[PDB]
């Protein structure tokens, strides 16, 4: 994803 | 916090 968020389940 | 992670509950 093109997103600045860093979390990944 | 000095962290690159972006999540906040």
């Amino acid at each position, epitope marked *: *994803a*093109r*997103t*600045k*968020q*860093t*979390a*990944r*389940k | 916090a*000095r*962290t*690159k*992670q*972006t*999540a906040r509950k």
Partner: antibody
Amino acid sequence: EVQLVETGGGVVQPGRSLRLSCTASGFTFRDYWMSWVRQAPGKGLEWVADIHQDGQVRYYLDAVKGRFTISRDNAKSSLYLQMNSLGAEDTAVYYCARNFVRGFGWHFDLWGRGTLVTVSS
Amino acid sequence: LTQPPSVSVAPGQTARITCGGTNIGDISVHWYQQRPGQAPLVVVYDDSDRPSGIPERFSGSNSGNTATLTISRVEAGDEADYYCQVWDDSINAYVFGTGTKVTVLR
């Protein structure tokens, strides 16, 4: 002109120590997180360590935590990796790499040509 | 992160290199090209952007559990190892895929 250059590689005895230097040119070194990434002969890339612009916040691969120390000298535009208690698993090409996030994700946007450390008696 | 050890493709045709990892689609993926004895070089970053210098034949996508590097109109110069990479915020580590050798059929 913009470049990273690793030195300090070569043979080193198991259990002994070696210190790698990375000399940065062509850019403002103190503005960047800097990293070490390694690659054992014929193997894949393996991240080793990050160091924050101001030299105190540091992250390590588990397998080297306790034995390796990453440090920097911004006045000298230089990155260091102090390697102790070396073993055969540490034998690899060690790359100096610049950290950058442009749009979205942190990656390595500048690499040195790397230097090979061989752990051997 | 999981990558096929190798992909081979005929010149002019299309190479697809996958990068597997749970929910990898939820974050940004970047791709390095490494020629033998050379330093890694970014060819695709932030899922699908190209650094200047990099031919438009290199594209990327990323969704679900699989990011994909696509090389169109393959030529001999594209022979190399390719590595995907993410950053893992749960352990503060950079993570690389195991790498894929592209071979060009002739």
